[PDB]
């Protein structure tokens, strides 16, 4: 009933080929939180007690 | 009240229910008894062939 | 042997999307009587007792 949040990924993560003594490179991710809320749908119908 | 075939309220008088609301079949509460021969009380019955 | 009756549906029933305090809509169905009565098919054939 309170809804949902989804952490959608957007980051260009990367890795590199290297020799024995080479400097290993540094990287970072990225995200954007999307959200979802429910909504009601409803209707009424009416009749005589007969 | 409301018309028959009112746009929002379902009633037994609406046309859409016509011929789904059949009466229960009852006995005849008003039947007269069967008549019987009066001459066969008053006249003598005779052996006949 | 009595035959059959069928309640054919014909009504455009409906519902709506609703907020918290929006007061809800009212709807009604619709129908038609359809009916089916049996009919006979028959034939005769004739032969000598011999």
CA B1 to chain C, closest CA, distance in angstroms equals: 17
DSSP C21-43: SPPPPB----EEEEEE-------
Burial group, residue C27, by CB count within 10 angstroms (0-12, 13-18, 19+): middle
The minimal CB distance from C17 to the residues A41, A44, A46 is found for A41
Residue C45's SS3 state is coil
List, in order, residues 6 or more apart from B15 with CB less than 8 Å away: B4, B5
Nearest to C15 by CA among A8, A44, B28, B33: A44
Residue B15's SS3 state is helix
CB contacts < 8 A (A, B): 13
Backbone angles phi, psi at C5, to 5 degrees: -120, 145
Contact A45, C27 (CB under 8 A): yes
Please tell me which residue of chain B has the smallest CA distance to A50.
B12
Q: Which residues of A touch B11 (CB under 8 A)?
A: 47-48, 50
Experimental method, per PDB record: cryo-EM
Please state whether beta strands A4-9 and A31-36 pair in parallel, antiparallel, or not at all (unpaired): antiparallel
CA A9 to chain C, closest CA, distance in angstroms equals: 31
List, in order, residues 6 or more apart from B43 with CB less than 8 Å away: none
Give the C-alpha separation, A3 to A29, whole Å.
26
Give the C-alpha separation, C27 to A44, whole Å.
6
Burial group, residue C33, by CB count within 10 angstroms (0-12, 13-18, 19+): middle
Resolution in angstroms comes to 3.0
Taken as a whole, chain B contains a residue count of: 49
């Amino acid at each position: 009933a309170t809804g949902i949040v989804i952490p959608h990924w957007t980051g260009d993560v990367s890795a590199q080929w290297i020799g024995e003594g080479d400097m290993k490179p540094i990287t970072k991710g990225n995200m954007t939180k999307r959200d979802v809320h429910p909504a009601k749908i409803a209707t009424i119908f009416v009749a005589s007690a007969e | 009240g409301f018309s028959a075939d009112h746009s929002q309220i379902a009633q037994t008088k609406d046309t859409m229910f016509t011929g789904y609301l059949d009466p229960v079949q009852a006995k005849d509460y008003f039947a007269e008894a069967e008549k019987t021969s009066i001459v066969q009380r008053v006249a003598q019955k005779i052996p006949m062939g």
